[PDB]
Amino acid sequence: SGAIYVGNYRVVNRHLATHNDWANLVWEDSSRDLLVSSTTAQGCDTIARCDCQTGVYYCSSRRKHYPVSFSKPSLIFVEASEYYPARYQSHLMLAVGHSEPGDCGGILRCQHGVVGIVSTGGNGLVGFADVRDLLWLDEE
Ligand SMILES: CCC(=O)NCc1nnc2n1CCCC2
Numbered sequence: 001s002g003a004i005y006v007g008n009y010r011v012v013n014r015h016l017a018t019h020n021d022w023a024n025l026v027w028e029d030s031s032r033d034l035l036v037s038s039t040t041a042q043g044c045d046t047i048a049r050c051d052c053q054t055g056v057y058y059c060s061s062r063r064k065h066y067p068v069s070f071s072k073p074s075l076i077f078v079e080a081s082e083y084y085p086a087r088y089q090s091h092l093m094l095a096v097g098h099s100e101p102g103d104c105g106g107i108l109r110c111q112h113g114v115v116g117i118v119s120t121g122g123n124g125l126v127g128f129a130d131v132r133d134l135l136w137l138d139e140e
């Protein structure tokens with residue numbers, strides 16, 4: 001589990017979005033495994049605006065943050081998981097690291113702020129859903 005709280009926005013994994021998220025929808029993409037809902041209180045997180053390929057991510061199944069190198073966001077085939085079938089996921093970054101289903105929503109951060117959240121795992125990789133490209137999460 002986990003979310004990004006930027007301005008009046010909650011960024012979550014689409015597959016973990018609640019009824020309240022859906023009832024306060026601002027934007028979803030099922031190929032990006034992202035959903036954004038509106039908040040009443042403002043959030044503490046800053047979104048990275050950069051093309052960094054190094055950062056640190058939180059792994060709840062280890063209670064540990066790991067420094068990782070990761071690929072640039074791309075369209076990638078993902079094998080079946082407990083929460084999605086085998087499918088193409090867009091805007092996905094991969095690193096060598098530990099990721100189980102419940103690690104989804106852990107932040108990846110670089111020197112510039114929040115890069116994305118854990119979205120995939122298995123076979124010794126962790127996959128992150130990029131948010132740097134959503135410039136609107138930092139704007140009105
Ligand atoms: C499909 C890409 C995307 O970002 N859709 C959400 C979105 N597009 N422009 C904006 N937003 C939300 C707030 C208005 C600014």
Ligand SMILES: [Zn+2]
Nearest residue numbers: 050052110112
């Ligand atoms: Zn950066």
